[PDB]
Amino acid sequence: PQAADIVIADAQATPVNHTFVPIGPDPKDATIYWWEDQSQASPAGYWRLSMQLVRPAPAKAGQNTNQRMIRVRVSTFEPILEVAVTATYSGIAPSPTVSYVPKAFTEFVLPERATLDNRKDIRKMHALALTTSEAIAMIESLQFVY
Amino acid sequence: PQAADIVIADAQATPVNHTFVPIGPDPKDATIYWWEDQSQASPAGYWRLSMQLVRPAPATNQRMIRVRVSTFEPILEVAVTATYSGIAPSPTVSYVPKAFTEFVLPERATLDNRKDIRKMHALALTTSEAIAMIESLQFVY
Amino acid sequence: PQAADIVIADAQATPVNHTFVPIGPDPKDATIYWWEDQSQASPAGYWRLSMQLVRPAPAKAGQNTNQRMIRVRVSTFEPILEVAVTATYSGIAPSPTVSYVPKAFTEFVLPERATLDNRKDIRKMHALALTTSEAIAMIESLQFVY
Amino acid sequence: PQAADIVIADAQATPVNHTFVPIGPDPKDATIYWWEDQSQASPAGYWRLSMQLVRPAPAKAGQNTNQRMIRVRVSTFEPILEVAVTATYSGIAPSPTVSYVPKAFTEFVLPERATLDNRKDIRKMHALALTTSEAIAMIESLQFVY
Amino acid sequence: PQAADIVIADAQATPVNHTFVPIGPDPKDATIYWWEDQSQASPAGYWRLSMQLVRPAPATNQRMIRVRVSTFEPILEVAVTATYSGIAPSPTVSYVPKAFTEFVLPERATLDNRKDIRKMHALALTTSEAIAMIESLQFVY
Amino acid sequence: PQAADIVIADAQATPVNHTFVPIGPDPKDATIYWWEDQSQASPAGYWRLSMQLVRPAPAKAGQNTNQRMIRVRVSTFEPILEVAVTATYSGIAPSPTVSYVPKAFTEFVLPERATLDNRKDIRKMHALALTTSEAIAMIESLQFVY
Ligand SMILES: [Ca+2]
């Protein structure tokens, strides 16, 4: 697929669509690509999304492939800003800094011999496992299972 | 909340519900809990789901709560019709597609921040780009 | 030109279009770009196409040009996946393995000195030379000229 | 196929047919045959075309074939003759000298195991890959894909 | 944005549009992208334009985004009418006027700050003083 | 030209003219001159502009000049202030400090043998290249080209 905007909904009372515009490929790794939500107050607080596909070297004739594997990594960074003062004096506006950065990192290990069905299974089922009542209780409510 | 069955839909043409029964906490680590789908051929191929919540000790602006959700879907080898000796081998695992997701949530982060990161990452796994990368194995250009 | 799908016709009775989706630039070498035909049986057997442009470091003031040269390499790989038969030692069918790989490699050496007309000439005339009755007889029917 | 003239069109505004008369097999290597375009200014600048078929020694009884391979190499050389200017040291105009040589080299690796369909596929699809808009942009306009 | 032709006007009596076709990213550095004006005599004299955007890695109040715009306008030597041997030399570059501009933009800097620095520097290159220094080679006294 | 005020327009909705009064030559380098926009809240936040012309030593009789070069450097500094509190208590006003400094540095390398036409070309065309839609997308919108 081509590089396009990626739109993801907020978790507010009335959800707000955040649009991640593609920034481009990573400077140092050609296998990871970067989108950015530039709606925040300064770039220090912009939210970032990165997707990475790592393919193995092409198979050789007669080579045994049951150990070659493909990796996919999705990563989201949502830095939160803070400000030292909330007003503006004599044209000097408050300049926010980063306060903390919640983030998430997901990695799929897909062995090259796997079926399209296996890949659809692992993708759908993991994405669903992130939305189970237990997952919500652990990530949002910070309560383990007893 | 108390641990109970976790039901997750298949990705077949007609989806099939897989029910992960709670097995219990990991003997080595009390922070990670295991559910298991026992519908497969033999227990070596049972699908597994682990959820882990690591809270820092009660007490310093670098204190972060971690949450790890992991899904393993091992695929067993099909029953053999013939071997060199005539005795069928033990059930063996052919390959294992798996997934590992980790949330890093600073202790200062508000409930709104946590809801945001969870919803938005889960959605980021279902984008057209994510589906092209994981299912069709295509990069973005 | 922005990277896009490359569609090339088969050589069957009724030609079948193969669509090569870009994978992207080689992480090991940035001067070579990769498209992949995902219509095969499993990824190890996906056909691939690679195009490489190697331009020399820019000319310097008073420098001598008469040896600086540009290279372009187009390569196509069409690996044929092995078809499984009954495995008798373990009764476990083997991982998908590549049986053999028919491939082609074309390299243009274009000296920087050369004119656009020279480059158009060499490209067109070589691409035609690959379609001559003699080339067809050598590659397809394995016959020399006498 | 008996050796005969090979006629290939130019890339000019009005294409001009170049006729390559066979010179014959290379005396040093019998598996490579040579045609020559004699329309240039003097023989040193005659364009040349070479086709090579390397078939392996015949399969032997009980021998293993899985590595034996056939190679076909088509090569085109279009040397550009230097245009003379006034010689000032001796006042004697120089012998015809080749200024630079744009050239192209294509090698097909066809494993003996491969079927006629495989060979037709690789030949047609590579010859087409040399005519894609991307190949035209790289060879003629010196632009990569991004 | 996707890369496309960049058209820049000459400084002739009647200006002439030079069209810089995108060549692509630099093989050595993925952060710098190259356009090329191919209207000159031979490729050694093609005019070039490079734009580079260096973002710091996602993660500390000394984190700065850099942007470098560079223009090269090499001037080739004219075709020779006579040499010592009678063979004309390969196209050679006589001299190269060039320009290099670098923006240092702290990550805390707001869109207004970035618009200010870009507009104001670009204007600073067109002041009467700048024109006297670059074109007429005169200092201010 | 004489040292005079330099007036440059803001990028606000309704642009505001900033007037850079000449401060004078640099203390340590006699080849770089300094203007300053003193409209800001305290000198820590004043905006500065510097122009530098570096000429080579005069040519010697019979000396070959194809390596001597002239450099011109224009530099703009726009520090942004921040304040700890926005009101005044008991006659104590808030005193701002510097928060961050966006800046820009441009260097022309003009070989001494270059024509007035070459210099006008490089000046105009670079100044224009700073205002292209791509330059605006990269500096203001922080998006690379893909
Ligand atoms: Ca692109």
PDB file of all heavy atoms in Angstrom, chain A residues 2-3 33, chain B residues 140-141, chain C residues 1-4 33, chain D residues 145-146, chain E residues 2-3 33, chain F residues 145-146, ligand 1:
ATOM      1  N   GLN A   2       0.282   2.360  -0.468  1.00  0.00           N
ATOM      2  CA  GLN A   2       1.016   3.608  -0.489  1.00  0.00           C
ATOM      3  C   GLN A   2       0.992   4.267   0.889  1.00  0.00           C
ATOM      4  O   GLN A   2       0.163   3.951   1.749  1.00  0.00           O
ATOM      5  CB  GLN A   2       0.421   4.538  -1.539  1.00  0.00           C
ATOM      6  CG  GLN A   2       1.305   5.675  -1.924  1.00  0.00           C
ATOM      7  CD  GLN A   2       0.699   6.484  -3.021  1.00  0.00           C
ATOM      8  OE1 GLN A   2       1.294   7.447  -3.481  1.00  0.00           O
ATOM      9  NE2 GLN A   2      -0.492   6.099  -3.456  1.00  0.00           N
ATOM     10  N   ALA A   3       1.928   5.187   1.102  1.00  0.00           N
ATOM     11  CA  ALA A   3       1.925   5.967   2.331  1.00  0.00           C
ATOM     12  C   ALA A   3       0.741   6.919   2.314  1.00  0.00           C
ATOM     13  O   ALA A   3       0.635   7.769   1.421  1.00  0.00           O
ATOM     14  CB  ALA A   3       3.232   6.733   2.486  1.00  0.00           C
ATOM     15  N   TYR A  33       8.642   2.634   9.031  1.00  0.00           N
ATOM     16  CA  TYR A  33       8.033   3.829   8.461  1.00  0.00           C
ATOM     17  C   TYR A  33       7.260   4.569   9.548  1.00  0.00           C
ATOM     18  O   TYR A  33       6.747   3.946  10.488  1.00  0.00           O
ATOM     19  CB  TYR A  33       7.097   3.461   7.299  1.00  0.00           C
ATOM     20  CG  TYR A  33       6.906   4.551   6.274  1.00  0.00           C
ATOM     21  CD1 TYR A  33       7.644   4.557   5.096  1.00  0.00           C
ATOM     22  CD2 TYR A  33       5.982   5.570   6.478  1.00  0.00           C
ATOM     23  CE1 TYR A  33       7.476   5.551   4.150  1.00  0.00           C
ATOM     24  CE2 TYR A  33       5.808   6.572   5.539  1.00  0.00           C
ATOM     25  CZ  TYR A  33       6.557   6.554   4.377  1.00  0.00           C
ATOM     26  OH  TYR A  33       6.394   7.542   3.438  1.00  0.00           O
TER      27      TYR A  33
ATOM     28  N   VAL B 140       5.381  -0.235   3.208  1.00  0.00           N
ATOM     29  CA  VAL B 140       4.859   1.015   2.660  1.00  0.00           C
ATOM     30  C   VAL B 140       5.985   1.762   1.953  1.00  0.00           C
ATOM     31  O   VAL B 140       7.121   1.818   2.441  1.00  0.00           O
ATOM     32  CB  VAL B 140       4.203   1.880   3.757  1.00  0.00           C
ATOM     33  CG1 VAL B 140       3.164   1.062   4.511  1.00  0.00           C
ATOM     34  CG2 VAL B 140       5.240   2.426   4.711  1.00  0.00           C
ATOM     35  N   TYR B 141       5.674   2.319   0.788  1.00  0.00           N
ATOM     36  CA  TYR B 141       6.680   2.935  -0.072  1.00  0.00           C
ATOM     37  C   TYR B 141       6.311   4.370  -0.460  1.00  0.00           C
ATOM     38  O   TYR B 141       7.006   5.005  -1.245  1.00  0.00           O
ATOM     39  CB  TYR B 141       6.889   2.081  -1.328  1.00  0.00           C
ATOM     40  CG  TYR B 141       5.615   1.530  -1.963  1.00  0.00           C
ATOM     41  CD1 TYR B 141       4.935   2.250  -2.939  1.00  0.00           C
ATOM     42  CD2 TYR B 141       5.110   0.284  -1.600  1.00  0.00           C
ATOM     43  CE1 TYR B 141       3.783   1.751  -3.526  1.00  0.00           C
ATOM     44  CE2 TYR B 141       3.955  -0.225  -2.184  1.00  0.00           C
ATOM     45  CZ  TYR B 141       3.298   0.515  -3.148  1.00  0.00           C
ATOM     46  OH  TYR B 141       2.155   0.019  -3.735  1.00  0.00           O
TER      47      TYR B 141
ATOM     48  N   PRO C   1      10.342   8.896 -10.537  1.00  0.00           N
ATOM     49  CA  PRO C   1       9.036   8.227 -10.539  1.00  0.00           C
ATOM     50  C   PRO C   1       8.750   7.556  -9.200  1.00  0.00           C
ATOM     51  O   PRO C   1       9.582   6.792  -8.723  1.00  0.00           O
ATOM     52  CB  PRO C   1       9.180   7.187 -11.652  1.00  0.00           C
ATOM     53  CG  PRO C   1      10.629   6.829 -11.615  1.00  0.00           C
ATOM     54  CD  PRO C   1      11.363   8.105 -11.248  1.00  0.00           C
ATOM     55  N   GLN C   2       7.601   7.846  -8.595  1.00  0.00           N
ATOM     56  CA  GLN C   2       7.275   7.211  -7.330  1.00  0.00           C
ATOM     57  C   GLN C   2       7.075   5.716  -7.545  1.00  0.00           C
ATOM     58  O   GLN C   2       6.636   5.275  -8.610  1.00  0.00           O
ATOM     59  CB  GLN C   2       6.030   7.859  -6.717  1.00  0.00           C
ATOM     60  CG  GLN C   2       5.658   7.321  -5.346  1.00  0.00           C
ATOM     61  CD  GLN C   2       5.028   8.381  -4.474  1.00  0.00           C
ATOM     62  OE1 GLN C   2       5.044   9.563  -4.819  1.00  0.00           O
ATOM     63  NE2 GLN C   2       4.475   7.969  -3.333  1.00  0.00           N
ATOM     64  N   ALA C   3       7.441   4.926  -6.541  1.00  0.00           N
ATOM     65  CA  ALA C   3       7.317   3.481  -6.661  1.00  0.00           C
ATOM     66  C   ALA C   3       5.851   3.083  -6.764  1.00  0.00           C
ATOM     67  O   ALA C   3       5.003   3.580  -6.016  1.00  0.00           O
ATOM     68  CB  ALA C   3       7.967   2.789  -5.465  1.00  0.00           C
ATOM     69  N   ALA C   4       5.553   2.194  -7.709  1.00  0.00           N
ATOM     70  CA  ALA C   4       4.203   1.667  -7.851  1.00  0.00           C
ATOM     71  C   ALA C   4       4.284   0.243  -8.379  1.00  0.00           C
ATOM     72  O   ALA C   4       5.354  -0.237  -8.755  1.00  0.00           O
ATOM     73  CB  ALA C   4       3.345   2.547  -8.763  1.00  0.00           C
ATOM     74  N   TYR C  33      16.223  -1.367  -5.475  1.00  0.00           N
ATOM     75  CA  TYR C  33      14.825  -1.372  -5.064  1.00  0.00           C
ATOM     76  C   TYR C  33      14.173  -2.677  -5.494  1.00  0.00           C
ATOM     77  O   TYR C  33      14.511  -3.236  -6.543  1.00  0.00           O
ATOM     78  CB  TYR C  33      14.055  -0.197  -5.683  1.00  0.00           C
ATOM     79  CG  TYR C  33      12.835   0.251  -4.895  1.00  0.00           C
ATOM     80  CD1 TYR C  33      12.933   1.279  -3.963  1.00  0.00           C
ATOM     81  CD2 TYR C  33      11.587  -0.333  -5.092  1.00  0.00           C
ATOM     82  CE1 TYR C  33      11.834   1.706  -3.241  1.00  0.00           C
ATOM     83  CE2 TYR C  33      10.475   0.091  -4.365  1.00  0.00           C
ATOM     84  CZ  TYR C  33      10.610   1.114  -3.444  1.00  0.00           C
ATOM     85  OH  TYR C  33       9.529   1.555  -2.712  1.00  0.00           O
TER      86      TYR C  33
ATOM     87  N   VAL D 145      13.570   5.237  -7.767  1.00  0.00           N
ATOM     88  CA  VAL D 145      12.185   5.204  -7.310  1.00  0.00           C
ATOM     89  C   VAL D 145      12.168   5.412  -5.798  1.00  0.00           C
ATOM     90  O   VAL D 145      13.094   5.013  -5.084  1.00  0.00           O
ATOM     91  CB  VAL D 145      11.487   3.889  -7.718  1.00  0.00           C
ATOM     92  CG1 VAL D 145      11.563   3.709  -9.228  1.00  0.00           C
ATOM     93  CG2 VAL D 145      12.133   2.711  -7.028  1.00  0.00           C
ATOM     94  N   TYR D 146      11.119   6.059  -5.308  1.00  0.00           N
ATOM     95  CA  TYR D 146      11.113   6.493  -3.913  1.00  0.00           C
ATOM     96  C   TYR D 146       9.758   6.301  -3.227  1.00  0.00           C
ATOM     97  O   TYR D 146       9.673   5.649  -2.183  1.00  0.00           O
ATOM     98  CB  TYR D 146      11.547   7.963  -3.834  1.00  0.00           C
ATOM     99  CG  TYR D 146      11.203   8.768  -5.072  1.00  0.00           C
ATOM    100  CD1 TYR D 146       9.978   9.420  -5.186  1.00  0.00           C
ATOM    101  CD2 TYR D 146      12.102   8.874  -6.126  1.00  0.00           C
ATOM    102  CE1 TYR D 146       9.661  10.153  -6.317  1.00  0.00           C
ATOM    103  CE2 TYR D 146      11.794   9.599  -7.259  1.00  0.00           C
ATOM    104  CZ  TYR D 146      10.576  10.238  -7.352  1.00  0.00           C
ATOM    105  OH  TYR D 146      10.280  10.965  -8.486  1.00  0.00           O
TER     106      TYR D 146
ATOM    107  N   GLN E   2       4.386  13.956  -1.296  1.00  0.00           N
ATOM    108  CA  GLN E   2       5.102  13.184  -2.299  1.00  0.00           C
ATOM    109  C   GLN E   2       6.011  14.089  -3.123  1.00  0.00           C
ATOM    110  O   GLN E   2       5.706  15.258  -3.374  1.00  0.00           O
ATOM    111  CB  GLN E   2       4.118  12.447  -3.202  1.00  0.00           C
ATOM    112  CG  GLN E   2       3.185  11.542  -2.422  1.00  0.00           C
ATOM    113  CD  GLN E   2       2.269  10.728  -3.305  1.00  0.00           C
ATOM    114  OE1 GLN E   2       2.232  10.909  -4.526  1.00  0.00           O
ATOM    115  NE2 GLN E   2       1.518   9.820  -2.689  1.00  0.00           N
ATOM    116  N   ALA E   3       7.146  13.535  -3.533  1.00  0.00           N
ATOM    117  CA  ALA E   3       8.153  14.311  -4.237  1.00  0.00           C
ATOM    118  C   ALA E   3       7.726  14.569  -5.675  1.00  0.00           C
ATOM    119  O   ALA E   3       7.280  13.656  -6.378  1.00  0.00           O
ATOM    120  CB  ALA E   3       9.491  13.575  -4.215  1.00  0.00           C
ATOM    121  N   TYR E  33      17.278  14.353   0.284  1.00  0.00           N
ATOM    122  CA  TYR E  33      16.602  14.038  -0.967  1.00  0.00           C
ATOM    123  C   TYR E  33      17.094  14.983  -2.054  1.00  0.00           C
ATOM    124  O   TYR E  33      17.306  16.176  -1.799  1.00  0.00           O
ATOM    125  CB  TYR E  33      15.077  14.160  -0.811  1.00  0.00           C
ATOM    126  CG  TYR E  33      14.280  13.518  -1.927  1.00  0.00           C
ATOM    127  CD1 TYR E  33      13.693  12.269  -1.756  1.00  0.00           C
ATOM    128  CD2 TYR E  33      14.112  14.159  -3.152  1.00  0.00           C
ATOM    129  CE1 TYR E  33      12.968  11.674  -2.775  1.00  0.00           C
ATOM    130  CE2 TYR E  33      13.391  13.568  -4.177  1.00  0.00           C
ATOM    131  CZ  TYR E  33      12.819  12.327  -3.980  1.00  0.00           C
ATOM    132  OH  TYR E  33      12.100  11.737  -4.993  1.00  0.00           O
TER     133      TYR E  33
ATOM    134  N   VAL F 145       9.687  14.374   1.965  1.00  0.00           N
ATOM    135  CA  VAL F 145       9.125  13.978   0.676  1.00  0.00           C
ATOM    136  C   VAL F 145       9.288  12.471   0.500  1.00  0.00           C
ATOM    137  O   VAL F 145      10.378  11.923   0.710  1.00  0.00           O
ATOM    138  CB  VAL F 145       9.779  14.754  -0.481  1.00  0.00           C
ATOM    139  CG1 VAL F 145       9.335  16.210  -0.453  1.00  0.00           C
ATOM    140  CG2 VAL F 145      11.290  14.667  -0.396  1.00  0.00           C
ATOM    141  N   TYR F 146       8.200  11.797   0.138  1.00  0.00           N
ATOM    142  CA  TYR F 146       8.196  10.341   0.021  1.00  0.00           C
ATOM    143  C   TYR F 146       7.741   9.879  -1.372  1.00  0.00           C
ATOM    144  O   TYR F 146       7.467   8.697  -1.589  1.00  0.00           O
ATOM    145  CB  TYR F 146       7.314   9.721   1.121  1.00  0.00           C
ATOM    146  CG  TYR F 146       6.015  10.467   1.428  1.00  0.00           C
ATOM    147  CD1 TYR F 146       4.838  10.176   0.739  1.00  0.00           C
ATOM    148  CD2 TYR F 146       5.963  11.440   2.423  1.00  0.00           C
ATOM    149  CE1 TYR F 146       3.650  10.846   1.024  1.00  0.00           C
ATOM    150  CE2 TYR F 146       4.779  12.116   2.714  1.00  0.00           C
ATOM    151  CZ  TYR F 146       3.630  11.816   2.013  1.00  0.00           C
ATOM    152  OH  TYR F 146       2.462  12.487   2.304  1.00  0.00           O
TER     153      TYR F 146
HETATM  154 CA    CA G   1       6.590   6.889  -2.661  1.00  0.00          CA
END
